[PDB]
């Protein structure tokens, strides 16, 4: 409450004009942060803001409760849904901020180079919606591989992504085979193109 008001002031002084940034980092938490975030951005503080949002997300949850919630994915309390809903809001904030960026690289690499498996999975999901999916191939993140794998069964794009993703011939081929065999309607011409591709990987 009062602390929050102080935080707004903390940033506000920073709006007028390194230190205030640090002071904000200390304060960071919740919804008021949304308004506060716009303020951080004013003096081009995109990169720091993301870590900020992420750290906050982790700070509330510590830790890994949401992951359990997803596993069940139950509508019931399960592990508590509340943690999940809360983080997503923060995640949306991170994505929302990412969009505004469009010195682009420094901001993005920060997000990717962070250890958060719901975050990245969410990020990817965010990317697919954008049809950013091609960019996905590029992402190095160790989180990415499991993301593709789990999602693997407009998933076809994910798979077109996947076989392409696998530099390795063997892995790539196995996927296209499944691609061809798959139960979603895909023309035979493509089914064969998959095989032609898969066979080539022989």
């Amino acid at each position: 409450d009062a602390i929050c008001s102080k935080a707004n002031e903390l940033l506000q002084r920073s709006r007028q004009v390194r230190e205030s940034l640090k002071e904000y980092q200390k304060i960071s938490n919740q919804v008021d942060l949304s308004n506060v975030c716009a303020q951080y951005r004013q003096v081009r503080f995109y990169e720091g803001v993301v870590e900020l949002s992420l750290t906050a997300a982790e700070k509330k949850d510590p830790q890994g409760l949401g992951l359990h919630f997803y596993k069940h994915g139950e509508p019931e309390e399960d592990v508590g849904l509340q943690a999940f809903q809360e983080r997503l809001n923060s995640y949306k904030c991170i994505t929302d901020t990412l969009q505004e960026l469009v010195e682009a690289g420094h901001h993005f690499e920060q997000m990717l180079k962070l250890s958060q498996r719901l975050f990245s999975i969410a990020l990817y999901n965010w990317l697919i919606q954008v049809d950013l999916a091609d960019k996905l191939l590029q992402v190095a993140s160790p989180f990415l591989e499991p993301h593709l794998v789990r999602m693997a069964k407009r998933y076809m794009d994910l798979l077109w992504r996947y076989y392409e993703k696998n530099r390795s011939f063997s892995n790539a081929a196995r996927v296209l085979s499944r691609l061809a065999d798959m139960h979603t309607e895909i023309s035979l011409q493509q089914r064969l193109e998959y095989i032609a591709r898969a066979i080539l990987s022989a």
């Binding site: 193109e193 032609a196 591709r197 080539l200 990987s201």
Partner: protein, 120 residues
């Protein structure tokens, strides 16, 4: 037959002269003229069927034909700066070529290091 292989060898050689010493664009044109390497579609396989048939002299030469193609193809298709830019072709060409190379690596010296030039 004897003369034909002769001309092919000469054509390949002129390709060499112009390969390096610049003239990236010219090299593709000539290589395609050879009618050895699949520029078109996935007809890469027909290039397989017609491969074993190839005379011993040419069968040997193909290694460099490939990789010359993926080179010019690479350098020419250096991602440009800032309109009609059909990057797609000279891209499809690499693809068909790679499928080709993929099909005959065993019947080749053993350098599918086309891959190194292929990517960046």
């Amino acid at each position: 037959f004897v003369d034909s292989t002769f001309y092919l060898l000469l054509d390949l050689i002129t390709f060499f002269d112009e390969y390096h010493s610049g003239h990236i664009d010219r090299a593709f044109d000539i290589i395609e003229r050879l009618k050895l390497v699949p520029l078109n579609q996935e007809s890469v396989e027909e290039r397989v069927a017609a491969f074993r048939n190839f005379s011993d002299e040419i069968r040997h030469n193909l290694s460099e034909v490939l990789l010359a193609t993926m080179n010019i193809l690479f350098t020419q298709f250096k991602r440009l700066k800032g309109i009609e830019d059909r990057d797609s072709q000279l891209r499809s060409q690499a693809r068909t070529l790679i499928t080709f190379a993929g099909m005959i690596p065993y019947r080749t010296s053993g350098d599918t290091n086309a891959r190194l030039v292929q990517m960046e």
